Every structure is written in C-alpha cells, then in structure tokens.
C-alpha cells in the first residue's frame, strides 16, 4: 500500500501550510501584514515550526497522569487523520459498505482528544476547559446526524460514492436551502478555529488541551485540530457541492473540486476573525432551544418528499 | 508679526450621524427568492431520481438475465 502514505505526508503539509492562511487571510481581514520576512512571502515559516516545536521543545507535565496525557496526542492525530480514508474524492481509499457512518463515528471519537486532556493534569484548572468542551460538542452531535439524514434521504444511501453521481445538473444547496445554512454552524461542533467554536482558544478562559500539553504534544494537537477544519470543508463540498463527475478524465474533477473546497476553507477563517465567542450557556440555547425544532421540522419535511414525488435509490 | 496655530472650519467634519443603512434585502423580497429557490430545488432534484429509475430496473435486470452465474 502506497496510497495511505501518499495521504498523510502531503496532508500534514496542508495543515502546515494552513498556518500561513491562518494569519495571511486573517491578517488582511484585520488589515495587517502576515508572513513576509522568513520566505519570499513567508513560505519558509510553516515548515520552520516543525523544526521549532519538536526537535528543541521538551516539556512533560508536573503532577501529570500515568500513561494517559501522552496517549491523547496519539488519539488526536490517529483518529482525525484516519478520517481522510473514507473520503470519496475522485476515487476513495477502500470504499466503505456505508460511507458517512464511518465519517460520523470517528468524528465523535476525535472529541476524546480534548476529553483525555482534562485528566492530563490532576489539578482542577485544566478540567474546567475540558468540562466546557463537553457541552460545546455534546449538544451539536444531535443535529449533525439529523441534518445528514434529511440530505441522505433526498439523495442515495449512506455510501459516499453515490453522493457524487446524484449532483449532475444542479447542487444540493438549492433544494436544502435552510439545511445548507445549518452546516456552517454544525460543522463547528469540533474544537475549531471559529467564532462559535469550543473551549480551545484563549480569549476569556485558559487554553483547553494546550495548558496541560507541552509544545510537542501541544504542537501535535494543532496538526489535528486544524486538520478537522479542512475535513469539514471537503465534507460540505461532497454533500452540498458537486458540479460535475467525469469518470474518464480525473484531471477535470481534481481542479474543480479543490476550488470549491478552498472557497469554504477561507470561509471558516472569515468566521473566526469577524465574531466574538457565543458563551458556554448561550451556545446551548442557540441549538436545542431554537435550532433543534427547526431541523426536525425540516427532517419531517424531507421524509414526505420521496413519497410525494418519487425519490428512492 | 507673530505666527501661531491657525483655525480651519470649512465643513466642520460633520459630527454624530448614523452611517448605517439597510441594503439589498428588505424583508418580503428575500422570502420570494428563498421559497423560489426551494421550489426550483425539489423540482429539479426529483427529475434525476425519475431518471435513476431508468437505470435502477435495468441494473437489477442483469442478475435476472444471467442464470449461468
């Protein structure tokens, strides 16, 4: 097998080259110059951080825990980078018997990275950032499965290969008009660089899964946390975008698929700079109280539609 | 003659005024586009599903036609 090794090393570079965009686009959004000194346009700085944070930075926590803690950055990468495997792409690595089920299960398993980092420090200061990270993720897992079901019943089955073929004339944004707007919010269930987000950034509280971790484990967390942002951006570009298929020419698909994802890649960092944090209590009131009755009403609506007019795979 | 700091009036900068104004969407206009996109959305989607039926029966026909398998 060569394909897996050709989907980790160039992918870790994409999370590395993200650091440019994380302060270049975000910089111009705030009217400030980002990467400039290090490279021609600061292009040598993202690869410099790998030399900076791993080879020279040494920390291990004080009071600590036993085997757990250092188990958590292994759980961070080894569950978020595996998410690249079930992706349909032009051609998938081992096409699943049911596609999106593996995508939804491993995403919830990726939440454990911020959960086990609560017991990284035995001291109570770190676990407050963990307990906040529970509720900021636990509620949004409800709608994430429901809004999927309304799209999946509209087009094909759980298999991700069928989701490419179903969009031949028009996108799925237009039939699922309120549901597409939900997937700019529901995608930010995992601790991502955003305005909605979770307990990961500083601002008000101490940094979750970062105050306990070093540099080396803490550096490994960013290579997983920012990796999930690309993952949700690609996953939205499958469920809601498509444009064309073309099995004969893979070259025409690969260029067209990347532009659609890159426009969404900018959009989350667009969200991050623009708006403040939603608060621990009031994020639980955005969904559950307000958005859950809306999504279920649309779920009720999407059950009737294949019966009203023929729509069965 | 002694020279000091001079005063300038002209327009007096215009202090305290609401620059915020509503643009593009009004209220009733965006809902006509919103439901209009939905009506166009479901109608175009189900036509492909009916086109899928042409393939669906024909794909399963291959198993019925092949009995030496």
From Swiss-Prot, chain A:
It is found in: Mitochondrion inner membrane. Keywords: Electron transport, Formylation, Membrane, Mitochondrion, Mitochondrion inner membrane, NAD, Respiratory chain, Translocase, Transmembrane, Transmembrane helix, Transport, Ubiquinone. InterPro entries: NADH_UbQ_OxRdtase_su1/FPO, NADH_UbQ_OxRdtase_su1_CS. GO terms for cellular component: mitochondrial inner membrane; respiratory chain complex I. It catalyses: a ubiquinone + NADH + 5 H(+)(in) = a ubiquinol + NAD(+) + 4 H(+)(out). GO terms for molecular function: NADH dehydrogenase (ubiquinone) activity. The keyword Chloroplast does not apply. The keyword Mitochondrion applies. The chain crosses the membrane at residues 1-20, 68-88, 98-118, 144-164, 170-190, 220-240, 251-271, 292-312. PANTHER family: NADH DEHYDROGENASE SUBUNIT 1 (PTHR11432), NADH-UBIQUINONE OXIDOREDUCTASE CHAIN 1 (PTHR11432:SF3). Core subunit of the mitochondrial membrane respiratory chain NADH dehydrogenase (Complex I) which catalyzes electron transfer from NADH through the respiratory chain, using ubiquinone as an electron acceptor. Essential for the catalytic activity of complex I. Essential for the assembly of complex I. HAMAP family: NDH1_NuoH. Core subunit of respiratory chain NADH dehydrogenase (Complex I) which is composed of 45 different subunits. This is NADH-ubiquinone oxidoreductase chain 1.
Curated annotation (Swiss-Prot), chain B:
It is found in: Mitochondrion inner membrane; Nucleus. The chain crosses the membrane at residues 27-46. Belongs to the complex I NDUFA13 subunit family. Complex I is composed of 45 different subunits. Interacts with CARD15, but not with CARD4. Interacts with STAT3, but not with STAT1, STAT2 and STAT5A. Interacts with OLFM4. Accessory subunit of the mitochondrial membrane respiratory chain NADH dehydrogenase (Complex I), that is believed not to be involved in catalysis. Complex I functions in the transfer of electrons from NADH to the respiratory chain. The immediate electron acceptor for the enzyme is believed to be ubiquinone. Involved in the interferon/all-trans-retinoic acid (IFN/RA) induced cell death. This apoptotic activity is inhibited by interaction with viral IRF1. Prevents the transactivation of STAT3 target genes. This is NADH dehydrogenase [ubiquinone] 1 alpha subcomplex subunit 13.
